[PDB]
Design a protein around this ligand. Sequence first.
Ligand SMILES: CCCC(=O)N[C@H]1CCOC1=O
Ligand SMILES: CCCC(=O)N[C@H]1CCOC1=O
Ligand SMILES: [Co+2]
Ligand SMILES: [Co+2]
Ligand SMILES: [Fe+3]
Ligand SMILES: [Fe+3]
Lengths: 277, 277
Amino acid sequence: KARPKLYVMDNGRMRMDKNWMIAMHNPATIHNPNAQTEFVEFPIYTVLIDHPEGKILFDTSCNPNSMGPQGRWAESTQQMFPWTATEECYLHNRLEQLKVRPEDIRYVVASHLHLDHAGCLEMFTNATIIVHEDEFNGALQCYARNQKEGAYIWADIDAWIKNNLQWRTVKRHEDNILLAEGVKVLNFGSGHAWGMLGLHVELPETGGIILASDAIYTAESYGPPIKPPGIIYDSLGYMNTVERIRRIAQETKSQVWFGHDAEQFKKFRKSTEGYYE
Amino acid sequence: KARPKLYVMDNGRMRMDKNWMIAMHNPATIHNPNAQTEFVEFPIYTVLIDHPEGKILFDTSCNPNSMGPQGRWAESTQQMFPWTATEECYLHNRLEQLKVRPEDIRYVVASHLHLDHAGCLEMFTNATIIVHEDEFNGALQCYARNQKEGAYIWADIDAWIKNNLQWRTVKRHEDNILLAEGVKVLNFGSGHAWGMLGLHVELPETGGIILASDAIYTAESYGPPIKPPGIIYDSLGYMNTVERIRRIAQETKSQVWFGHDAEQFKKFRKSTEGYYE
Ligand SMILES: CCCC(=O)N[C@H]1CCOC1=O
Ligand SMILES: CCCC(=O)N[C@H]1CCOC1=O
Ligand SMILES: [Co+2]
Ligand SMILES: [Co+2]
Ligand SMILES: [Fe+3]
Ligand SMILES: [Fe+3]
């Protein structure tokens, strides 16, 4: 029958230029030539699926040692994308509170390898890390070219390699993957980043849930109409992916969980209050 | 053997949010959370090639009845993308000063069908209008859907149809087109817009010139590295096109004439001073 529990874990808050999230949200005009943007706050979160076939983790938030003078993040990154989180927000702690040790995780699904999703991959040395092959390649290049700024953290990648993580790459033209009963990895491909993965979870009580991650930032992104983010890798791929998610949602009667929607996140039942069955 | 003359015609100035031109040019930070943008000015220009095989026109600037309360442009468009031009800047007049009547143009190459490139297509009823099939399709849909805002001017398209222009669409996968001796239409495809066309001109005295139009806004866009515009239709297509242009430039020892580079345009010899042979 399979009766898993799905947990939403609060991994703190991030701020950044609204223009990153919604491209040209407030363009300058003849009467407002020096138009001002805003510095919006949004949640960073991860999802644990306590499944009888094994524990599945979607995204891993930011590394505890990201911010500060001795942080892994470049100063420019910290100033443009500041992450704030109490100690109880760290992924290791959120898992501990559920009496889950990193070594208990069978599968980690990395939606992508941005600094706010792949922060703690290095913990799960007993898991198979599932990632898009193009995203993996892209990140490894950033590392090889000794890129010290941008959304791919050199020090994080460094740790992945040293900790000898076990990778299973999703091929560009690879079908969706049945990870477990009612759990499907969605191959979104290029869009927001080089290679995006999603989850479709079918819960006996709650029903269908799509984890879109950064494929869809917020409800505003989702529309319709679609309001794309400030910087995109593959604009065409991004638009296709959103509409693909909308279709799947309609066809399977599934909720869509956005990557960084403050309003939606407030309404989630977090790991401090319970779970979804 | 062919000894054409190429004219750069000044069709006025436009202003818009700098973020349109260079995506995230000045992102908000923790110390500057309400970062301000700028309202940059840039030139609108067209190119006439007086060729023995016939007169070739690249782009057609804006329509004279674009701006104002009884203008073709929507109010929001006028406020975000204001076009300023004296009467001598109108395309019809620039051509007249060269003793060229619209009926004298054999070929018009529409780089794309944005408001600042396809403004005056409706004049050239005696020409073959060369346009990318995807761009044409895109514009005709805006018309059919009665889209009154955006970069595709309903009234302009209306006039094209009423004036019974003769179209030659460049197919998505169509090779470059030899328009005349030393004049080649470059199929850039999707990028900035649905379908971008460029021109490669080989001048006996001046040598190779690539007309990039909005494939490359400015020298800053060109880099390297590449700094893409704020809104893009096909980001992947855009990046490839830029690098394709760089390659062609290097392989053929050609100058690259950007779409809206104030500095570059300053240095051009305009139709009021002469031409390029
Ligand atoms: C795409 C570069 C900007 C970036 O990395 N943004 C972060 C903030 C939250 O979602 C993200 O991916
Ligand atoms: C796509 C950005 C909005 C737009 O159409 N801008 C115009 C002004 C400069 O050349 C353009 O393409
Ligand atoms: Co991301
Ligand atoms: Co344009
Ligand atoms: Fe993110
Ligand atoms: Fe333009």
